[PDB]
């Protein structure tokens, strides 16, 4: 089919602009000289609008139309690809190209601005951009339109189907189960010694471990690389180039470990999406939610599984000797999985983690129903952390400025971490049927069985299935919170109670 | 509105260049080998994207409309359009589909080249060197030429330079160098060069390179230093000119002169009139003029023994065991040693030109179809014997030595000699306004020298042509005499 090839040719063209775009973003987070900032933001905006144009072009629209009528004579991937392109057409089409362009430029600038604001713990430096980033999104919500809550317009950008109504009901149950559970954890003298955790752990050695764990867990270094960054992230330049980045803290080796493993999650996913889909519309994660189910599956359902540490603790002890000298493997894991309310989401424990997502969800729900101004955000932010965690951020760096998501314009994203955590919980239990020897594998430092399970259930499909079908097909039951609640509940009732 | 729409196309090209530059730089500093293929494609798409703007019909329309209206355009705009017209006319002779696959080939070929050099295996790079040469022979056809077919490629870098010109030009060089080296190779004055090949800790070298970069004027808020196989300097945008180097713990010289050399390109790129930023004119006047700046920094500063007066203290403290009880005097005497060798990039001042000539003739033979790919390693090793009296034992130190070809840079090499000549001329003339030059180096005060180079060379960007740059700066067109005298004198006082 000629029209088909002209269609995929265009996507593959977009594919290349994407690599250039992702590299520029990655380069900006790994050393790009500040003097080049302005032109760098300009170029990212140009190549982004290029992609935008190829997707909003009359020709693209004609190719879609034609291919829809001949829908039956086409293969599965082609059908899904055109339906996907059709939505992206109708969707972008609602936005003035001149606006998308300056927005993209603003994001590139806002993020560099943000990186500085956070490093200095300066809200006022970021504030100006935050106001615009939002002002743009409010406007975009108008252009796309919505059915219930205007915030759904943004939620739909990451989890098609997830609405404010659906989330309220679900975050309700999480509160109902986590908060009281976290109170019990707080009301006990079972607090495990964690003194050895906050000691000095030489950076150079943490770097060795992160690289090591990556190799161990299955991250392909021939198709990736590890580098340092203020805020860890994983990006896909092209199917053969999926990079991850982490952050080291000599007073908490944990941050790098779980951050690296977290990112390793996304990477593994990306490094296993069917190669046939490469260069196309469907070579991407099913949704942030399903993507986060992979990062969280690795970080939490492996990295935070005590058997995962049996074989590796020997190394950790040798990397920073004086610190873990005479610390029991048993004490070590108990120290790692210490649950207690803290300020940083990225570094929070498994039990208190969901609350962070909830806090962000609600603040955003407010920002887009015009209930809060940029000026009162820090105050609103701090209040929520008190309501759900009983602690109040004292600095901007550990407060509102903590995450990069807003700086990049990613509003409506955060809830996907919650969902992702739920998906991970559900995938984990169902995986036990096929791999009962799970904990045994971790102790043997054997991860291909687990990885393979995920590749066939999630990875490989890429965007050939939607989240709903991904989970129903893998566990044979739609997304159900009970699993996460049971996992968490059962796990933190034994460590403390 | 025409002039505006015109510069708007140029700025549009400028952002594609950053993207391309970055993709290139990234592929030389870490990019995963599995994204190798698609990386080539993206460079190709983005490169062809720039090509299409320069060859578009609307661009040609804007070109003509501004020419009619010429006399009313500004000096910058005039030159901007003259350049746009040259590239339009030049690129229009090449089939788009072909430039695209050619760009993709260079990207893939350079990747294959890094590996071939690493494994010292020519067979791995041969399949590519075959295609690169083919495309270009074919390009000579499209562009056309007058005297020698190689003239079409030489024109890509040094407009106005031809085989006739270079033959005569190099002829005088061989004549002055060859006998001069015999002498140096024939004297019991061989400076002691034992402490050089000692072990110099890589991590320490890196500190020095960063130190010298700061000293010589490189702006780190506008750039960065990173490692690579083959050092180079690139401009992503006016405020992002990066430089790379290569550390050898068994000869610190490689990283030092390598960095300072790249610093030259950078100090230049970082001083082109900002007004030309985002345009057609914000670049080097030509490869020769660029190599004139890198070579001025590398040789006329780095190799002027006075340069080491203020820094020799640091070199000793970085690797104390190595330079323990070695006189500053003996140091500079060893640094500027002159013995025939295999690697151009590391070759000494006296023998450097011979390396360029060897490549000049080889390339000349290549495009006049007087040699096949299969026979190049042979011919190459022969010339290295013909001019240096030594034969490469591995293709790594032989024909795989430099990257240029893998990158599709044929007709580029001569520009190093022209730059070296330009440097020699700029130098002697600079002595007129700066006699205390050697005094400045002893104090490590370079601002006087940089500012001179900036007013005479950098600031202009592409506003002036090389012929214009040199005439305006020295008062006379280019002249080999300055380089011959400089080398003649300098290396006669060392050994003879
Ligand atoms: Cl990021
Ligand atoms: Cl981002
Ligand atoms: Cl194994
Ligand atoms: Cl290169
Ligand atoms: Cl002296
Ligand atoms: Cl190159
Ligand atoms: Cl002197
Ligand atoms: F890098
Ligand atoms: Zn994540
Ligand atoms: Zn970002
Ligand atoms: Zn295995
Ligand atoms: Zn150079
Ligand atoms: Zn002297
Ligand atoms: Zn290159
Ligand atoms: Zn002197």
mmCIF file of N, CA and C in Angstrom, chain A residues 203-221 224-228 244 246 248 256-257 260-261 264 315:
data_model
loop_
_atom_site.group_PDB
_atom_site.id
_atom_site.type_symbol
_atom_site.label_atom_id
_atom_site.label_comp_id
_atom_site.label_asym_id
_atom_site.label_seq_id
_atom_site.Cartn_x
_atom_site.Cartn_y
_atom_site.Cartn_z
ATOM 1 N N UNK A 203 30.913 8.983 47.226
ATOM 2 C CA UNK A 203 30.259 9.116 45.935
ATOM 3 C C UNK A 203 30.801 8.147 44.898
ATOM 4 N N UNK A 204 32.114 8.139 44.732
ATOM 5 C CA UNK A 204 32.731 7.267 43.758
ATOM 6 C C UNK A 204 32.275 5.825 43.923
ATOM 7 N N UNK A 205 32.004 5.418 45.155
ATOM 8 C CA UNK A 205 31.553 4.056 45.397
ATOM 9 C C UNK A 205 30.071 3.879 45.073
ATOM 10 N N UNK A 206 29.275 4.919 45.289
ATOM 11 C CA UNK A 206 27.856 4.832 44.990
ATOM 12 C C UNK A 206 27.701 4.708 43.489
ATOM 13 N N UNK A 207 28.588 5.374 42.762
ATOM 14 C CA UNK A 207 28.546 5.339 41.315
ATOM 15 C C UNK A 207 28.792 3.918 40.857
ATOM 16 N N UNK A 208 29.763 3.250 41.479
ATOM 17 C CA UNK A 208 30.083 1.866 41.134
ATOM 18 C C UNK A 208 28.881 0.956 41.333
ATOM 19 N N UNK A 209 28.164 1.141 42.437
ATOM 20 C CA UNK A 209 26.999 0.320 42.724
ATOM 21 C C UNK A 209 25.870 0.527 41.731
ATOM 22 N N UNK A 210 25.512 1.785 41.483
ATOM 23 C CA UNK A 210 24.438 2.082 40.539
ATOM 24 C C UNK A 210 24.701 1.429 39.191
ATOM 25 N N UNK A 211 25.931 1.548 38.704
ATOM 26 C CA UNK A 211 26.282 0.950 37.431
ATOM 27 C C UNK A 211 26.146 -0.559 37.552
ATOM 28 N N UNK A 212 26.634 -1.087 38.670
ATOM 29 C CA UNK A 212 26.580 -2.519 38.946
ATOM 30 C C UNK A 212 25.137 -3.025 38.951
ATOM 31 N N UNK A 213 24.289 -2.412 39.774
ATOM 32 C CA UNK A 213 22.895 -2.819 39.857
ATOM 33 C C UNK A 213 22.206 -2.755 38.505
ATOM 34 N N UNK A 214 22.595 -1.777 37.695
ATOM 35 C CA UNK A 214 22.008 -1.644 36.375
ATOM 36 C C UNK A 214 22.328 -2.905 35.588
ATOM 37 N N UNK A 215 23.605 -3.279 35.561
ATOM 38 C CA UNK A 215 24.041 -4.475 34.841
ATOM 39 C C UNK A 215 23.288 -5.707 35.348
ATOM 40 N N UNK A 216 23.252 -5.849 36.670
ATOM 41 C CA UNK A 216 22.585 -6.956 37.341
ATOM 42 C C UNK A 216 21.116 -7.071 36.990
ATOM 43 N N UNK A 217 20.420 -5.944 37.014
ATOM 44 C CA UNK A 217 18.998 -5.922 36.725
ATOM 45 C C UNK A 217 18.601 -6.055 35.263
ATOM 46 N N UNK A 218 19.546 -5.931 34.342
ATOM 47 C CA UNK A 218 19.186 -6.083 32.940
ATOM 48 C C UNK A 218 19.207 -4.863 32.037
ATOM 49 N N UNK A 219 19.681 -3.728 32.541
ATOM 50 C CA UNK A 219 19.761 -2.520 31.735
ATOM 51 C C UNK A 219 20.861 -2.752 30.703
ATOM 52 N N UNK A 220 20.518 -2.640 29.423
ATOM 53 C CA UNK A 220 21.475 -2.853 28.328
ATOM 54 C C UNK A 220 22.369 -1.636 28.122
ATOM 55 N N UNK A 221 23.641 -1.719 28.503
ATOM 56 C CA UNK A 221 24.524 -0.573 28.315
ATOM 57 C C UNK A 221 24.923 -0.320 26.860
ATOM 58 N N UNK A 224 22.257 2.183 26.035
ATOM 59 C CA UNK A 224 22.010 3.211 27.025
ATOM 60 C C UNK A 224 23.274 3.695 27.702
ATOM 61 N N UNK A 225 23.097 4.473 28.768
ATOM 62 C CA UNK A 225 24.203 5.017 29.553
ATOM 63 C C UNK A 225 23.678 5.681 30.821
ATOM 64 N N UNK A 226 24.560 5.836 31.807
ATOM 65 C CA UNK A 226 24.204 6.468 33.080
ATOM 66 C C UNK A 226 24.984 7.763 33.229
ATOM 67 N N UNK A 227 24.317 8.809 33.705
ATOM 68 C CA UNK A 227 24.957 10.108 33.910
ATOM 69 C C UNK A 227 24.334 10.802 35.128
ATOM 70 N N UNK A 228 24.995 11.833 35.660
ATOM 71 C CA UNK A 228 24.462 12.568 36.817
ATOM 72 C C UNK A 228 23.522 13.708 36.441
ATOM 73 N N UNK A 244 19.495 6.750 31.208
ATOM 74 C CA UNK A 244 19.040 6.948 32.574
ATOM 75 C C UNK A 244 20.048 7.838 33.307
ATOM 76 N N UNK A 246 21.022 9.557 37.427
ATOM 77 C CA UNK A 246 20.755 9.509 38.854
ATOM 78 C C UNK A 246 21.449 10.639 39.599
ATOM 79 N N UNK A 248 23.621 11.466 43.382
ATOM 80 C CA UNK A 248 24.271 10.881 44.539
ATOM 81 C C UNK A 248 24.223 11.802 45.743
ATOM 82 N N UNK A 256 20.533 7.356 45.505
ATOM 83 C CA UNK A 256 21.074 6.929 44.229
ATOM 84 C C UNK A 256 20.567 5.534 43.861
ATOM 85 N N UNK A 257 20.668 4.592 44.798
ATOM 86 C CA UNK A 257 20.221 3.212 44.586
ATOM 87 C C UNK A 257 18.804 3.131 44.025
ATOM 88 N N UNK A 260 18.284 5.137 40.760
ATOM 89 C CA UNK A 260 18.833 4.413 39.638
ATOM 90 C C UNK A 260 17.906 3.261 39.306
ATOM 91 N N UNK A 261 17.590 2.431 40.290
ATOM 92 C CA UNK A 261 16.711 1.306 40.018
ATOM 93 C C UNK A 261 15.367 1.771 39.464
ATOM 94 N N UNK A 264 15.925 2.570 36.028
ATOM 95 C CA UNK A 264 16.244 1.322 35.360
ATOM 96 C C UNK A 264 14.939 0.665 34.946
ATOM 97 N N UNK A 315 28.407 -6.626 49.096
ATOM 98 C CA UNK A 315 29.033 -5.561 48.328
ATOM 99 C C UNK A 315 28.875 -4.232 49.044
#
